[PDB]
Design a protein around this nucleic acid. Structure first.
Lengths: 399, 508
RNA sequence: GUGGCGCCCGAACAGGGAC
């Protein structure tokens, strides 16, 4: 075995806020103690916990990481181990992720990180607590994968040495690769066996694919301005979209509403009116001009179910500086569990964020802070987020 | 017997001292000599001022929960604290000293210094260390570190025999096996809880409602009764508390409406007190009823007609909200109450057309796996915010000055209906909605007024029914008495239909 | 001289929004 010293630099020992989750997590904690990865020592000192249940699985998978410390210590470990943001994602058919989460859990664990290796073990009604759940490569700590940068490379060596067009990338609990998917699946089968060779495990299936995601091209408000209601909504979004698409000009728009008519007043179109209408509809429908993503500049999220179980989820940093026009619809085993539906939808889109610029910045989901803190575990799939109940501005893409 | 450093010695004086235990130091020195709690002393020191506990002010040294109905009903209680501290670090095993004579005899205290900022957690850690072998031998036992005593469970005289053997197993590390536990009385005399398997509840309660006082006694009795009201249902202090806004001498009593309610509230408590224990076999059935006037209550019970526990729901915020807002809040809060007592979630059995809220839920900007258990209460909004039109495309709006803006809103209508709002010292937002309400009051049932500001839409969209500002209650009533309503929002500085002809009244 | 927890309130930092 072998490892290396720290690259540390925070101390928010806080962890998190289910009788069954706690009756089922103890099992993994005890299993790890039986083997020995996480120590049971919690009385001395003053990290987060989570349980998950996703596709193709029966048990409750443990979850642990601390965004506060993670981000705090992000600088050195991530900068010393920086990805050349491999942008070879478009030219592909599918990609799977690393189901394995203990291959790196077999490294020679660290100690000095115990004071920054916080954990937690709550107690029902403050009655039955546990000391604590520890060491390097526990379950996350992105820097940790960077420390497994040598392991990821040791593996990419024979893998890519077998499949040149098979590009090998790494991710937190995920690896990253339009050839035949079946060949992709075998490549993974052989890589699972390979790992087996040098003592690694591989604990249906989604296998996210590039060819499916796209940029939803926002559409027009109406075919015509028959009613001032439709035209008002159209202009309202034009004005607010002006911060994004400045082409919106009211040199004649206001004059177009010539008389002081009413909301639903029937309305045909004139020459200049219809001309400007077509001109700007295409204008906005034009590509995204001047918006370019730079991993140095972080991004922001904007998620909303768009009413009927659909979802309007974007990724952008500056106001009106939309980097991704993603969407979401058709939540299987959903469409009535609103929270869950968008939970999975927004997780997905997080991944698309990662492929667009690498990261997945904090979200501003609309759930009640209580509601989100009380139902994030129910369907936990994959950070620090805020909350919005904002007005309609995304209501410019479609209906 | 067993144990598990520094700060991130010291010197500390005291203030004029107590002469009663003045020679307690020379006696506690021997008490600790025998239990090796202190040594004889390196400049280390903390302050000391108290008695007959010869404690010390470790403030300077610092500077250097389950629910009464949160346990099942096995036939056994085990409560026993060994002191329980001086029975188990070196840089810190010598610096604890003190003295204030008229040699300044201080020495090297070296055992658990109850009072050090954090010692409770160490006591709990050892408590757990003792419990570790207890679960190794018979994990069937339940333990709770509520205090430094024991809360144990083993369902009896036969079970008590094995319980004594364990108490004695505690004695190994110098623990107590005293035949003086608070077993006789299920009621946890200590720490204000009338505990009993058959029935769980708070023991301490009284309310001297005789004279007309409202200064601090009122706050004390409202918070006490409510914090204690876990299983005392039939009380509310939203009103009573909503009027006491930052007073501790103002002696001004309450309304007779609230007061009257208060009378009832007090009287109800008189009724017997029996909160139910925890039930592992089956979950609970929950119904939440609106106590009228924003007031709301909820019960968490597994026994029908035998309310295992109770709860309230009056947590509001923001400007306006709705019955569904309270519902969602109450659900989150009760959910957490459940997770604290049981962990599960009781049957959300209350009186709503689930489809009706379903449409609400798909209306709002907002996981109640619930049921539409019918009951007389009325949980619903009273306005229908359409998404299509019917309504002379009103033109209400208004600007003013940043300095004071002196209210003075106005509104027009595509049929000629214009109305002003000389609001005395009013803000642009406020007056906009007030003037719109005024246009609404003379309006027909089918009335669509296109707003000209965001605040108005923001609120209207959220189907506001409750009201703190009387103008808001006024529109609530107008929306209910109206049927056809279409709402719109628009900016200024653009110009459409009639909006500049209207906005040309910022000052005059 | 003091604190734990809780409670009733207040103040306040930050963020967003509006003018």
């Amino acid at each position: 075995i072998e490892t290396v010293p720290v690259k540390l630099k925070d101390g928010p020992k806080v962890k998190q806020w289910t009788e069954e989750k706690i009756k089922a997590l103890v099992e993994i904690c005890t299993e790890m103690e039986k083997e020995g990865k996480i120590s049971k020592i919690g009385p001395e000192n003053p990290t987060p916990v989570f349980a998950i249940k996703k596709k193709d699985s029966t048990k409750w998978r443990k979850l642990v990481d601390f965004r506060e410390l993670n981000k705090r210590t992000q600088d050195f470990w991530e900068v010393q181990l920086g990805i050349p943001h491999p942008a070879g994602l478009k030219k592909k058919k599918s990609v799977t992720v690393l189901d394995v989460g203990d291959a790196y859990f077999s490294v020679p664990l660290d100690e000095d990180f115990r004071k920054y290796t916080a954990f937690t073990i709550p107690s029902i009604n403050n009655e039955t607590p546990g000391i604590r759940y520890y060491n390097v490569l526990p379950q996350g700590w992105k820097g940790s994968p960077a420390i497994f940068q040598s392991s990821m490379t040791k593996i990419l060596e024979p893998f890519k040495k077998q499949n040149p067009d098979i590009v090998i990338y790494q991710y937190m609990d995920d690896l990253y690769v339009d050839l035949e998917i079946g060949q992709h699946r075998t490549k993974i089968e052989e890589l699972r066996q390979h790992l087996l060779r040098w003592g690694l495990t591989t604990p249906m299936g989604y296998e996210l694919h590039p060819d499916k995601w796209t940029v939803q091209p926002i559409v027009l408000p109406e075919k015509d301005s028959w009613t001032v209601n439709d035209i008002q909504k159209l202009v309202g979004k034009l004005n607010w979209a002006s911060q994004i698409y400045p082409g919106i000009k009211v040199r004649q728009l206001s004059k177009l509403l010539r008389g002081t008519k009413a909301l639903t007043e029937v309305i045909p179109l004139t020459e200049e009116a219809e001309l400007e209408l077509a001109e700007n509809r295409e204008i906005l429908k034009e590509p995204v001009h001047g918006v370019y993503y730079d991993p140095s500049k972080d991004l922001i999220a904007e998620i909303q179910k768009q009413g009927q179980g659909q979802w309007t989820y974007q990724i952008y940093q500056e106001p009106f500086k939309n980097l991704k026009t993603g969407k979401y619809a058709r939540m299987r085993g959903a469409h009535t569990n609103d929270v869950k539906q968008l939970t999975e939808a927004v997780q997905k889109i997080t991944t698309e964020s990662i492929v667009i610029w690498g990261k997945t910045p904090k979200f501003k989901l609309p759930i009640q802070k209580e509601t989100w803190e009380t139902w994030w575990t129910e369907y936990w799939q994959a950070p620090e987020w805020e909350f919005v109940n904002t007005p309609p501005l995304v209501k410019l893409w479609y209906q | 017997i067993e144990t598990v450093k520094l700060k991130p010695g010291p010197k500390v004086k005291q203030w004029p001292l107590t002469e009663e235990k003045i020679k307690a130091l020379v006696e506690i020195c021997t008490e600790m000599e025998k239990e090796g709690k202190i040594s004889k002393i390196n400049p280390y020191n903390t302050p000391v001022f108290a008695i007959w506990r010869k404690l010390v002010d470790f403030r300077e040294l610092n500077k250097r929960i389950p629910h009464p109905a949160g346990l099942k009903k096995k036939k056994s209680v085990t409560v026993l604290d060994v002191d329980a501290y001086f029975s188990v670090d070196e840089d810190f095993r010598k610096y604890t000293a003190f003295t204030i004579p008229s040699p300044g005899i201080r020495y090297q205290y070296n055992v658990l210094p109850q009072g050090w900022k954090g010692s409770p957690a160490i006591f709990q850690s050892s408590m757990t260390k003792i419990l570790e072998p207890f679960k190794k031998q018979n994990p069937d036992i339940v333990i709770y570190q509520y205090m430094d005593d024991l809360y144990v469970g083993s369902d009896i005289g036969q079970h008590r025999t094995k319980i004594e053997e364990l108490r004695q197993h505690l004695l190994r590390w110098g623990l107590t096996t005293p035949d003086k536990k608070h077993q006789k009385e299920p009621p946890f005399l200590w720490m204000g809880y009338e505990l009993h398997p058959d029935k769980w509840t708070v023991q301490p309660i009284v309310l001297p409602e005789k004279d007309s006082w409202t200064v601090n006694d009122i706050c004390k009795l409202v918070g006490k009764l409510n914090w204690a009201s876990q299983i005392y249902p039939g009380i509310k202090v939203r009103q009573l508390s909503k009027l006491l806004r930052g007073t501790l001498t103002e002696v001004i009593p309450l309304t007779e409406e609230a007061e009257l309610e208060l009378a009832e509230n007090r009287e109800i408590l008189k009724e017997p007190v029996h909160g139910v224990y925890y039930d592992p076999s089956k979950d609970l059935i929950a119904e939440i009823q609106k106590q009228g006037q924003g007031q709301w209550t909820y019960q968490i019970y597994q026994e029908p007609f035998k309310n295992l526990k109770t709860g309230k729901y009056a947590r509001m915020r923001g400007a306006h909200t709705n019955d569904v807002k309270q519902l969602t809040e109450a659900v989150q809060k009760i959910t957490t109450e459940s997770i604290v007592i049981w962990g599960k979630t009781p049957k959300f059995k209350l009186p709503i057309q689930k489809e009706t809220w379903e449409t609400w839920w798909t209306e709002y900007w907002q996981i109640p796996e619930w049921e539409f258990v019918n009951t007389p209460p009325l949980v619903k909004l009273w306005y229908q915010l359409e998404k299509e039109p019917i309504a002379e495309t009103f033109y209400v709006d208004g600007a003013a000055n940043r300095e004071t803006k002196l209210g003075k809103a106005g509104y027009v209508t595509n049929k000629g209906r214009q109305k002003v709002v000389p609001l005395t010292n009013t803000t642009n937002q406020k007056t906009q909605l007030q003037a719109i309400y005024l246009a609404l009051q003379d309006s027909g049932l089918e009335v669509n007024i296109v707003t000209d500001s965001q605040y108005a839409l923001g609120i209207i969209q959220a189907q506001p029914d409750k009201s703190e500002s009387e103008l808001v209650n006024q529109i609530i009533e107008q929306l209910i008495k109206k049927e056809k309503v279409y709402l719109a929002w628009v900016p200024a500085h653009k110009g459409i239909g009639g909006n500049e002809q209207v906005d040309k009244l910022v000052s005059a």
